[PDB]
Amino acid sequence: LGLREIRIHLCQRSPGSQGVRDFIEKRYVELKKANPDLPILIRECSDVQPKLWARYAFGQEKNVSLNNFSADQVTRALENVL
Amino acid sequence: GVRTSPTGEKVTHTGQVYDDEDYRRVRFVGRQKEVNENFAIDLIAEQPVSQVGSRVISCDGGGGALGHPRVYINLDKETKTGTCGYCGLQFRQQH
Amino acid sequence: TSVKPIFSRDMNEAKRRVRELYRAWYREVPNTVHLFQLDISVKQGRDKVREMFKKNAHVTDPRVVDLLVIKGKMELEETINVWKQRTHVMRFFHETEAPRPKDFLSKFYVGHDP
C-alpha cells in the first residue's frame, strides 16, 4: 500500500540539518496542502542525526538520512519516498 | 465483649477478622486463638472525667518517674475535655 | 600507564596454561567421581566442566585470564584433596531446580521478572 506517516528528526547545529531547516522554513506548505492525509511529524531535541523516516505498509519504518545534504536533494529523497 | 463474625471465631480489638475463603482459619485448627479478653476502648468510660478548679493543668501518670513524662494540657475548649495523648484520661475546669 | 601483570606476556602463555589446566581437570574428574561415591556419568560431568570453561571464553584481558587460571588451580587442589565434601561437588552441579527459562511469556505469567 501507500505512504502513511513521515518522520523528520532535526537539531540546531549540523549543515545537513541546516539544509532541512531551510526546507522546513520554506517548503512545508505544499506537502500538507497537497496531502492532508499525512501527519508528517517534526522533531527537535538538542542534537540528533537529521533523519527522514516513513512508517507505512503493515509496520515498515523505512530509513534514510539527511546528513550533509542540500535541500533540493532532501526534497528529491522526499519525493523518492513519496 | 467480643463480636462473633459469620466465620465463627473470636474477633480482636483490631479489625483483622477473617473471611470464609481463608486457609488461616484451618491452620487455627486444634489450637485456640488466644486473645486479650480485656479490651482498651472500654476502659476509657470506666475512668471518671476529673474536674480541676485550675485552667492550665498537669498530667503525670500516677508516680514520679513511673509512667509517661509530664505534659501540661489546656482547658480553653469550653465543652471539650482536655485529653492527654499519653494517658487517655480526661480533665475539666470548675471556675 | 604502568601495570604489572601476573604471568602473561601475550595470550599465548594464557592459552598454554589454560589448556594444561584443562588437562589437569580431565585427569581430575574420574578419580573424584570414583572417590566421593557420586551418582553422575563421567560424560555429563566432563561436559559440564567444558561448558563452565566455555562460559568465560569472552575475556581477552590477560590479567583476568591469569586470575581465572589461579582460581581454577585453587579449586582443583581443593577437590584433588578430600578437603571438599560431597555437598560442594554436587553444588557445582544443578540437579535441584532452578527451572527458570528465558521466555518472555513464561516470565509474564510468573510476573515482575523483566
Place this chain on the structure above:
Amino acid sequence: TQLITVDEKLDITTLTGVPEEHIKTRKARIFVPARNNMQSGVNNTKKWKMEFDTRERWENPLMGWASTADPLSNLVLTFSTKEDAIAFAEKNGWSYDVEERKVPKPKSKSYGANFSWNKRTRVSTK
C-alpha cells in the same frame, strides 16, 4: 617492576561472583539524594548514592511481612564524585542511570525590599 601494562578497560564482573541474572537484568541509579523536605539542611547532600531499582515484595502469609527474592535490594554506595561513580559502575559491569546534581538557586532578597514603598513586595502582616 615496569612490566607488561596495557591501557585498556576492566572486566571485574567475571570475578565478583554475583550471577548473570542479577548482572544483566538489574539496573543501577546514581544520584545525589535530595534534601528531605520537612527539614531544611543539606548535610545529606555532597554524596553520590548508587542504588538499585526496587522489585517485588509480596506478603509473608503467616505474619504479614514483606519478603523478597532480592539480595541486592538493600545496597547503597555513597560516593564523592560522579566520575568515580560512573567508573565503578562500568568497572563492575551492570548498567546505570545518571541523574545530575541540582544546587539551590541563589536568590536576591532583603528586609528593606520587604518594606517597599511603591514596589509590590510588601510583607502585609508585620
Place this chain on the structure above:
Amino acid sequence: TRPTVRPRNDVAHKQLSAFGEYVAEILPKYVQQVQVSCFSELEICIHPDGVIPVLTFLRDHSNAQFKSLADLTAVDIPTRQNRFEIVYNLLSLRFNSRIRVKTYTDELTPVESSVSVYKAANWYEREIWDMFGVFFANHPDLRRILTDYGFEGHPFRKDFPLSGYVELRYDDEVKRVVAEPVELAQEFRKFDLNSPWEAFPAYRQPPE
C-alpha cells in the same frame, strides 16, 4: 577540660614526629605520607612497590626493631581508582610503639607478598585473598580459608550485599543439600541514620 576528658602527652607526639620525619628522609623512594594523629600512633603511607624493601628495613636497623606483625586488611574504599588499602600493623618488642604501614593498591595488580620476611603473614594473606581477591604473586599456597569452598564472590567487598546470593536447604528429591537463590523471611530494614548538621567543624572538607 581536665575531668572526664583524656589528657595526652606532647612528648610522645614530638618523638613520633621526629621519628617519622627521620624514616621519611632516609627512605625517600616510597614515602608519600607520614601522618601522626592526636594520640601518637604513627601512620606511614606507601606506594605498592617498596613493600619488601620497607619491611626489610623496618624489621631491623637497630633504630626501629618492630618484630611483631599484626593486621593486614585492605579497607574497601570506593570513589578511588586504587580501591583497596593493605594495612600492615607493626609493634616493637624493644620500643613499645605502634606503626601502621598503609600501602595502597588497586583491584588487579599485586603487591609483593610480605610472607617472605613475615612468617605471620601467611594465613593473613590467604584471608585477604579469600575475602577480597588481592592477588599475591610469589606466595607458596593461596586457597580459600574462612569461606565455603563452592562459594564465591569475595564477600567482604562492598559490592557483595549483606545476605548471600545462595542459601542452602536440604531436600529429599535428590536426597542432599542444595543451594538456591536467597529467599529472605524478612527485609533487613535500613535506617537512614546519617543525620545532618555537621557534628565536627574541624573535619570539614572543602566543597565545590
Place this chain on the structure above:
Amino acid sequence: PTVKPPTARKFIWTNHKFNLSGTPQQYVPYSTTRKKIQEWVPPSTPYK
C-alpha cells in the same frame, strides 16, 4: 511472698496456667494487620 502477696491492678489472671505446648490449646501465629490495598469489587449488575 505471703508477707506481701498482692498487687493493686485489675487485670491479673487467676490461673497462671503451666506450659501448655503440645496440646489442642496453645499459640498460633498470625499477622495482626488489616487489608493491604482493598481489591476492586466490581458492580454486579449485568449488561446486555
Place this chain on the structure above:
Amino acid sequence: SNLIEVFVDGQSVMVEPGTTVLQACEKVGMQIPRFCYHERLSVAGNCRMCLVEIEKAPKVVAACAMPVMKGWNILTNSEKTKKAREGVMEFLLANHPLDCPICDQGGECDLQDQSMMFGSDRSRFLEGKRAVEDKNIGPLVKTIMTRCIQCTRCIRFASEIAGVDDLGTTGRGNDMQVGTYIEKMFMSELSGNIIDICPVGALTSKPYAFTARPWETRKTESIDVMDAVGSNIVVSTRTGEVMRILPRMHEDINEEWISDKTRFAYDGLKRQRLTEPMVRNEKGLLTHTTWEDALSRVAGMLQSCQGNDVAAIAGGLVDAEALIALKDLLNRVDSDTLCTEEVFPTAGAGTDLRSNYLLNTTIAGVEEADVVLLVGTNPRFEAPLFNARIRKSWLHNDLKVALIGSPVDLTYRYDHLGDSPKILQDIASGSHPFSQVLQEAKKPMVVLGSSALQRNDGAAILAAVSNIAQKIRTSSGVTGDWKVMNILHRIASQVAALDLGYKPGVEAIRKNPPKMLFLLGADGGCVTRQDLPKDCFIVYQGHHGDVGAPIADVILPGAAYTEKSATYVNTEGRAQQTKVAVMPPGLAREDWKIIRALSEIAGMTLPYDTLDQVRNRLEEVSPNLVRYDDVEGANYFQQASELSKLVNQQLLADPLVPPQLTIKDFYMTDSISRASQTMAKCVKAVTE
C-alpha cells in the same frame, strides 16, 4: 567588580553585594543552624539562633539578615558564639511539652537534632511550663499548638505564597497564640504544604498521623502524576508497601512544593484496586480467572476481528512504554484507531511540529517574563504549582497578568478583560490600552488554558492566539530567541501521547464504531456501549475502576504510578523516569509486559522482551525520550502560524468558562483522588 572579601575563620572567599552572611557561610560549607530563615520565604529574625561573633563588635549579631561590608572575619567556633547557642537552645526547651513519644516528628525533629549537636545537657527551669490548647485548622492537617515555638514561618508562608491571610499572631509576652481567631476551618490550596514548613511537631499530617516514624521507611525517587509539571516525589515506603510521600526539589520546576491532591492521593491508590484478570460469565455476570483463558479469549477475538475495527482509548495515567507496546501490537495486526481521552485539534499541525502542543516557555523562565495574559483557565484549580510560580513572579519582580473568560478566585489581583472570543478578535485588531502593552512590551507571554480547548472552538481559538503570537513575535524585537506562546494541560499521558504522535480526541471512534477496543485508563463515559455495536469487546485495563468497570467485558489489572520504572513526560518536554517502590497487590502485572505477553499468546510476535529493548524502541520513536531530566526548546512558530490558516473557522460569542471552578471540582475530578475517602472528608468539610 562587585566582590566582597570575607574570611571564614581565615579562609578567604568572595561575596556578592547585598547578600547575607548566611549565604556565604553556606557557600563555604558551614551550615549555621537556623530556625526562622528558610530560602523559599522572606527573612524574619525571630528565632535568634543564627547569632555569630563577628569581630571588633561587643554585641553578637544575627546572620540571616546582616548586610556584608567589605573585609569581614567571621568567628563561628569562638567561645561566646557557643555560649549564645547554649543559651538560646536552653530558652527554647522551657515551654515545650514532653511529647517526643507522641510527636510525629521523632526521626525528623529540629529541636532534637540541633539540641543534641549544639545545646546543653543538664536542664533547668524546674516549675512552670505553660500550655496552649490546640485549634481545628483543617481535617487534612492535624494541629497541636502547644508545640508551636512561635517561629513565624507558616505566617510568612501564608502571606507570601498562599495569599490567604488567615494565620496571625495574637497576644504579647509569653502568650502568643498563632492561628486563626474566629473558629474558621482554614481550607485553601497548598494547605497540605504547611506540614512540611512547620519545623517542629506542631502541624502534622492528619491521615498519616500515627502509622510510622521515619527511620523504618525507606526513601525512593519517583516522578509525580496528576499534574503536567512533576514535582519530584520521594516515597517513604514500608512493609513491602507504603507509608507516605514528600516533595523533593528540582531547581527549575516545582521547587519545594507539591499538590494537595498529590499529597493525599495514596489513600485512594490503596483503596479499591483492580487485582485479577476478569472475564464475563454465561449468566451475564463478571468473575475472575487465570491469565491463560482470559488472554486466549482476547487473542482469539483479536485474530477473528480485523480491519479498522480495532480501537484503543488511552486516557488517565498510562506510560510511554505501554503506548509504544500498544502501537507496536496494533500496527503489527493490521491498522489502528488509537485515540486519547481529551480533544486537541489537528489542522495547523497539532500532532507533529513540536511547538504548538506543549508549554514552549521554560517554567523557570516565566520569572523573567514581563507581561502575561491568560486565556480561559483557573490555575488555582488547574495545577496550582504553576500558580504558585506566577505569584512568586508577581511578588518578586513586576508582571501584568490578564485573565480572559471567568471571574474566579485567583488570589493575586489579576486584571480581567472579559469573556468573549470577539475580545480576542479585538486584541488581534486590537483597540485596547493593553494590546498596546502586548505589542509594545519587551517579554510577552500568553498562556492558553486547555479547559477552553476542550470545547468546540479548538482550531479557531488556537489559530487566533497563534496569530497573536506571530504578531507580537514579529513585532517588538523579542528577543531572540524567546516566546510569547505557551499552553498548559491537566493530564500527563495526554501530553505523552501527543509526543508519540497519536490522534487526540475520540472523534475517530465517534466516526468508526469498532468491533473491539482497549480502554487503557478510561476514566468516565468517553464512549458508551450505545454508540457502538452491541458485541463491544472492551478490554478495560487499570486500577480501581469505578466507571468502565461496570461497563466491563474483559478486565485487566493494570499497574499504578508507584509500581513500575516507567517514563513520563511533563508539559515542557522534559522526560523523567519513574522508579519502582511497591509491587502491585494481587497479580496485577506490568502494562507493556501484558501487551507483549498478549502478542506472544496470539499467533504473532514482537521483537522485544526487556525494558532496555522497550527503551530502544522508544528511542527510535523519539530521541529526546531517553535524555532524562533534560530540556530543549521548540521553534517554527511562523511555520505553525502560516499553517494555522488552512481551515479558517468562525468564533462563537458565548461566554467561555472552565469546568474547574472551585475546591470540590478540583478535588474530585480524577480517578485516584476520586477513589479516596479523606478527599471526601475535606469535601464535606468544605460544604459543612
